[PDB]
RNA sequence: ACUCUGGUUUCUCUUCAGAUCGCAUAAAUCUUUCGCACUAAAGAUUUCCGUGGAGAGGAACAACUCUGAGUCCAAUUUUUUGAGGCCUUGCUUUGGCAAGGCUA
């Protein structure tokens, strides 16, 4: 369209005209750890592209992180999309899809709709830090979503300008890194094809701070402009990886000559750097010109005046010149949208790429059926109105079309949950400024407006009066759970729809969020962490609902489980008096229900293979192997219902026709659990029998789902119950000294230290530790005050673990307000949230039998 | 005029360390966690006083907490505890741990941390592994050598005959990382009146020992 | 098979259905296929296998349910639909498009139709509850209401939903939300006799940007001049329409003569000098009125001799004199005086008169005790128009059909209307949930705040 | 590689300046708030301490550093030739044009 937009390098047609094009494009997510550079590398991109757009001096602009809480917190908080044309080496111009994502691991969820709605991955390393928490924590999810991997590794500038290093030494650091990096990928993948290597060109480094970046082959190409005769590409081969070089024969060899050259990385690369920096921060008066002159850059008399930093910062520009290396790292290895499509598809379409639909989507093609899909939920400045942000797989969205948008329950036999809606708008969506636009073919990533009324987390936008068979994608599968619960209520009641309206909009800005409304009428947010929550009220507060909110404090979700089998095989009748069904509960076996999370088993399997892998990895009967009918609450669910009715006793034809009605009483029981009204995880239910009316309208609906559900409470609570800790892994990058605090602080919180292995190359500590998630709070304050702020830590989800205590002990005593022992804080926890949840004052072992 | 003023880096690394004694040598803004004026006005705001913060008049009226009638919201009987909620919780997260956040400021999060390594012996080269670096544990498709690349004798590294560090190099690196006053090469001449040579000092916390009244 | 047999339709009970609130999901807070059941009148969300609505058939055994969109009926649990005409009145209840009942005035039906329990009412005359304190907008709303014209207009949900409106435009939630209000006031067949405007009122706070607050009282006057001008601004689709409902109903034209002053603290002879200054004479500032200002002559002060009562008695004529024509009100802004001289020139088909009661003294507000007598079936206002403009209008006749009163203090004041019911001649006071029925005598003996005429 | 503006220093006047006008920090007045106001907070105004930007004027010595403007390639893959000649068909603007098969 026409409508006034920044200065730029390029045109926006020729933004336009890329985007018909789906070979030219690249759909990028820069992931990484917290603070390792990626939105200021995004920043000097930007100001590649847009000459009008200049950084402070002093202050690190950021064009992207453009929220109010992102600004004054200085940490990333949502995912922030940016359409660029950026030129290659050759000096090809693509076009770029790179989604900007948050590096604090409470927002991992962020990264996680960042990585559905893109092809490739460039995870940011800090060359001081070097491989952290959610470095590890993001390349697991990227390559367990069938992504390319690409590094930046961020901030060499640290190794020259902080740590000191000799160039060597920095070498050494850089190819620990890598190393470390791909030691991961090879244990998190079982492909060994994606090695990461600067040779390869996967590898960039960077310095978004000084404006260094450059691969091997720009920088080789650097040395082929400033010397002709020579060709870049194969002296990029030759920079990396031990290999000497010889200036008597002008050779590059793997033996090393004079036993005192150093590598061709550190001769050519390395050290001209390190004399750069080292002659701008120290001979800048006396001999910057001659380096200047013998560099080729020439700066004028104001531009020397600058201080060190910012000259530091013209001086790297005029040299590396544009962002070429990052361009050919995210091209050759990054698929474009028509290569990557077929594993996207794969991966995420419900309908598989065997359906003809899947095939149609494989090609990405801009003249097909509209098959976009949007993950993120973008709110205005005004925050009523909300665009729906998603890539378009195929077909062409237009504005002002009419349009199907497809929820996370729409399906081909139930399609209620879908809405004919009319498109307002679409934009291109840039950080600070939308170029709006009337179509957007198949491959890029589009704003689409009205669309998001009939859509709270995902969304599957198709066309109207066609796709018959057109399903929805799966819903995001997070990094990490959601565990940190607080209730919210208004300060005023009489302004309680407000704040309602607040919580449906937070649910659709945090993909993550949960927000629901108890048996008590409590309303109850679910967050990752402190911070998340923190900004999530801050949003529900002053930017959705600006009402008075009251926040309890913040307590965990716990789980319910079973140590050991039940005492006596529990019944129950439907209330027709008919179907009996006999069942007890057992724990499962040791990682069984890690392996049913981690999707390692899936009942979508046939009989065959999964009785095979349950009788080996498991060793468990061909009977009991066989007979497996559901996995927990939802799919992939730490529970298992299995039937040890010998068909002799009960019909396997009969006991069919109500499986589905016993499923779902099974896992609806299992979602809500008889302790606390909380998760049941990793127990194993056995229908040891089954009596069922041979007439349909005596069985199934109302009579078998209720009946179901209490006697699986029954097994439950007559096998010993137990509640379940969320206990979160903790990673505190701490000085030397430090250390020794930190296990004071974790001393407090019942935290227990795994390992304090020091970072190689740094003078820092990374202090692992498991402290239980109901115990962290304020951990991260604790550490940081005491430490005088130099501890810095980050707490994420790891696993459930048992409660000291046996939630079922009528002779504990707690007072109102007491820190209770360890030996009952089970038993505290248990009618706590009973009495948060609003069911009885304590529940009982006979509750749910049929005998009382 | 005497208004702007612009020096050479020698002279600012000598100005920087004849005025050691007045800078506390730090090198983040990590020393002022919940410390910094965000933090000081949140908990303004909230009427509450960090430890080593002042303690201002509340800025809006507040009603004793004895004043609300047991509501189903703050029942205590549903309330679990496992440690004090303490005054720095509710500042560094004040939409969390407040029900009426109003006027607070979002404290800065945390920086990465700055892993200068400070050099004591001049003798020493710039760029030396100094013990305190944590030494590394050393331990490709590599081409081959066999192969007929060759480097044109026009081709050298950039800087070949730059030496990689000068007398004055680790004294820039220092004034990297030097107080504001001396970050700078070039400035503006500023008023005897206009520069606090101690704010820095009780900007910082109060030292361990020390009596009551140097604390207040 | 399994619809018109479905067992479980005794369970239903009307008792507990309320459908005057938000349609979101009690659980999820989603307002997409929000579900009610029938047997606790909850919302919940959903229809399909995990939805909360199915979970929670399943767990308190109630297997009814109603699509607050689609207007089906369902039994979630072997999940099919449910075809009965007798649950046809609920949805009636859910959507009570009360096209015809709304086509007269909302009261013009005087039926003792019956509400499901045992409660006869007349549609139109119905109840509004008072949320805290909202009995001024009760008063404005029902005012409004009975309004044959505008009520019509609202009655049919197709007359404004097809009107296009800006993307992040707010202002026509007042719009539906009020034509919702008028299908469930003039509904024939109610559960209740009354009718929640909980969600008019908070449509009505979000629009006014935390003013005329449900908590706190505010004037009826500035609430009824801004929900007019609010429903002319959003009935304007996009642009300024400028003939809506609420202009052809209530907006009328009137010709302000406005003549400048001079100084009165000046000699006689600069006085008559500025007389030929062109700019202290009568002006042509003719504009749209959407309703008349009365201004009640100040209170006697002192009592008269006579045996009458302390209350002062104005007649309605009276008060309609400054709009005659000859009449000349001063008015002085800051150091400027001016002489408002006003004629009417188009007469409305429904005059709205907005008596000024509360004036702002030196210290507090005063509300004037002034009664007005007015007479109820026959005013004649051919003598408040000028002669070329008394030909156009055939019918200058006025009923006085609703008639706002406010009771008490200024502070704590209470609103209550009195509504002249059509089809029947009865007239009926309402104050939030009393409905009594007042003589036709004694209707000008209240201190009369708002008034609505119909023209004939 | 050759020409021509824009110079720097200082004094004064005018105007704008929400820019941390200031990497510092005072005073007064009014209102408000609970105490009962140096030992107290909020809101607002104003005055002082003194800056930045632009323009104008004065006088001191520098006049082209900078900012700029005006101003060595014949042997594959482009610019030192596979280059020219024969025949047939449609129109002949009876010069030849368009296509194909050739010889080189």
Known sequence: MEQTLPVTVYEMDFLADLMDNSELIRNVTLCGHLHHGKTCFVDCLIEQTHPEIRKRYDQDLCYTDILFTEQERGVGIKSTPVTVVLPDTKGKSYLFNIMDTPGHVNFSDEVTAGLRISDGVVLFIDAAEGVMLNTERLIKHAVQERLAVTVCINKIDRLILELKLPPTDAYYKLRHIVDEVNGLISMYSTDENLILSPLLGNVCFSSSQYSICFTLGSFAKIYADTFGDINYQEFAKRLWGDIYFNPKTRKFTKKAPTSSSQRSFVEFILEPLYKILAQVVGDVDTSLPRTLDELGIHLTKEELKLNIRPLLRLVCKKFFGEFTGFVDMCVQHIPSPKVGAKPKIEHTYTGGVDSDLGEAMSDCDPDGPLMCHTTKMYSTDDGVQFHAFGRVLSGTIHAGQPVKVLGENYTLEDEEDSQICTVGRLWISVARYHIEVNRVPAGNWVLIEGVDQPIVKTATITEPRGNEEAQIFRPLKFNTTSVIKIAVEPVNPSELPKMLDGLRKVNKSYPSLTTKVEESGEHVILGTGELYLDCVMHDLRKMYSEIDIKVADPVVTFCETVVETSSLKCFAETPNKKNKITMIAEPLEKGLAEDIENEVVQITWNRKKLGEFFQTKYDWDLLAARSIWAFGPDATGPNILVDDTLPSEVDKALLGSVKDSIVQGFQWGTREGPLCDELIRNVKFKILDAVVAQEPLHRGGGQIIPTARRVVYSAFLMATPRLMEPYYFVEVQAPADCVSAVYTVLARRRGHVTQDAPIPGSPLYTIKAFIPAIDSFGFETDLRTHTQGQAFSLSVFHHWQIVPGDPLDKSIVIRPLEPQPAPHLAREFMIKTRRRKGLSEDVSISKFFDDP | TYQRWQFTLPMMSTLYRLANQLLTDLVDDNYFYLFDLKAFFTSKALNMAIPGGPKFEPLVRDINLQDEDWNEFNDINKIIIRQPIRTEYKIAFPYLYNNLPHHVHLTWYHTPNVVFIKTEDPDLPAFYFDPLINPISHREPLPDDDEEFELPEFVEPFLKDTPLYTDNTANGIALLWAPRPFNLRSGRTRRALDIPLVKNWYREHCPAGQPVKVRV | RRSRHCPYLDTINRSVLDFDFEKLCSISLSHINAYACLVCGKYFQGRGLKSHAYIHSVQFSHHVFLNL????????????????????????????????????????????????????????????????????????????????????????????????????????????????????????????????????????????????????????????????????????????????????????????????????????????????????????????????????????????????????????????????????????????????????????????????????????VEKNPTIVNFPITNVDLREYLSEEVQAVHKNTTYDLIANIVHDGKPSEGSYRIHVLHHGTGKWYELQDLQVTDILPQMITLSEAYIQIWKRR
């Open chain 3, 69 to 364: 969109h689609t207007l089906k009926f369902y039994c979630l649990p072997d999940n099919y639909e449910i075809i009965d005409s007798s649950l046809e009145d609920i949805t009636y209840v859910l959507k009570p498009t009360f096209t015809k009942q709304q086509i007269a005035n909302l009261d013009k039906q005087a039926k003792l139709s019956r509400a499901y329990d045992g409660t006869t009412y007349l549609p139109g005359i119905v109840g509004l509850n008072n949320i805290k304190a909202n009995d001024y907008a009760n008063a404005v709303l029902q005012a409004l209401s009975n309004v044959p014209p505008l009520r019509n207009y609202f009655l049919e949900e197709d007359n404004y939903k097809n009107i296009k409106r800006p993307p992040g435009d707010i202002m026509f939630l007042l719009v539906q939300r009020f034509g919702e209000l008028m299908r469930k006031l003039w509904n024939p067949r109610n559960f209740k006799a009354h009718v929640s405007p909980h969600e008019m009122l908070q449509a009505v706070v979000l629009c006014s940007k935390k003013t005329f607050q449900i908590t706190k009282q505010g004037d009826g006057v500035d609430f009824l001049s801004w929900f007019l001008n609010a429903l002319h601004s959003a009935l304007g689709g996009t642009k300024k329409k400028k003939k809506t409902i609420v202009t052809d109903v209530f907006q009328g034209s009137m010709r302000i003569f406005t003549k400048k002053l001079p100084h009165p603290d000046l000699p006689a002879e600069e006085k008559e000098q500025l007389l030929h200054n062109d700019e202290y004479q009568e002006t042509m500032v003719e504009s749209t009125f959407m309703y008349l200002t009365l201004d009640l002559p100040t209170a006697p002060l002192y009592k008269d001799e006579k045996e009458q009562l302390i209350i002062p008695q104005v007649p309605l004529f009276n008060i309609l004199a400054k709009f005659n024509g000859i009449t000349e009100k001063e008015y002085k802004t800051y150091k400027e005086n001016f002489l408002k001289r006003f004629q009417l020139t188009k007469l409305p088909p429904y005059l709205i008169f907005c008596i000024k009661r509360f004036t702002k003294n030196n210290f507090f």
